[PDB]
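URGENT: need a sanity check before tomorrow's submission.

F., can you look over the Integrin beta-2,Talin-1 record below? I want to be sure the sequence and structure line up before it goes out.
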Amino acid sequence: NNDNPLFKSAMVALSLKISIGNVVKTMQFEPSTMVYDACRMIRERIPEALAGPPNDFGLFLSDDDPKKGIWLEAGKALDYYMLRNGDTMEYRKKQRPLKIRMLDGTVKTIMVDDSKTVTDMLMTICARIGITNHDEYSLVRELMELNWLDHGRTLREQGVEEHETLLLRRKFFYSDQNVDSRDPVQLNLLYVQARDDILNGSHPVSFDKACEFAGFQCQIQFGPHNEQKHKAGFLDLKDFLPKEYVKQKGERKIFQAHKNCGQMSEIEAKVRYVKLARSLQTYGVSFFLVKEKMKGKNKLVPRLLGITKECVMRVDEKTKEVIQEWSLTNIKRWAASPKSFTLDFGDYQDGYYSVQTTEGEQIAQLIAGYIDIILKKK
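Structure tokens as predicted:
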């Protein structure tokens, strides 16, 4: 039957659960307390808060949905964050390991500031491995379209948790690839890259070309065509043709192209493979499958939309013919939403070009990125 000298009204103090690893303690804060001073008071009450230099720790407001967890800023008052009695704050190390697959295919773990955006993290990575031009590179997930990361947002809010390894990826440069039979190791790297892009469909090609490529691929993998062993049914066509072309009728066309190679060496076939790829107007282009509205028709028409350093291009989805091309110079503005992408060509044409796609923000950022480059050369 006593009074409690510790009691303060629920309205004048914030009662928060402070979590450090598996330790939790409830402490009382004046609600205008700055985050950095709250960290001090935490160090005075919880021994596990002393597990490192004091400025290495901060406060993190977790959530049942990990995408909604946020780091608190040191200069903000606690009541800025709309906290209520009983809420939980983690006292957390500000840097955390981020696993990144290097350009040599190995994984390196790099400490990054966990409150920052993907761009900031990329900059920390490039700093650690001696890359000055971080704008030549980006981070992508390794899932599977779903691997794209918006570098102006955080990993956390895009659903990337701390366990996930990301890939460091060099962007495409036409100046990167200059073919020659003198350097077999570099020739093979170029061949593998061009072949993989065709087989996985990121370089879209016609059916006839896909079988031509497969003909060189056969020369490379099997040597000269031998009608005793390279007969109907031999090929696992899924390994030689883009998925949309995996049809038995393609094998006859591949074998024709293979035979046409004669006794051509493995090196010479790799040269021809790479040369044929670079000869196509689709080479090096970043493509997106978008849905177009054609005047007259009610069903939208799937179309390949390609973005390069100097143009936007419409490509037929079945034949891969280049239907139309717009210089980046002749685009007045663009817009993206989660469901569409629209281009305004000012007085170069009547009507906007507006398509359905879930990759509109990706398209918009590519266009903006390539336009900024042209500006900086001016």
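My own read: Helices lie at 35-45, 118-128, 184-199, 207-222, 249-259, 266-278, 360-376. The first strand starts at residue 14 and ends at 20. If you see anything odd, call me.
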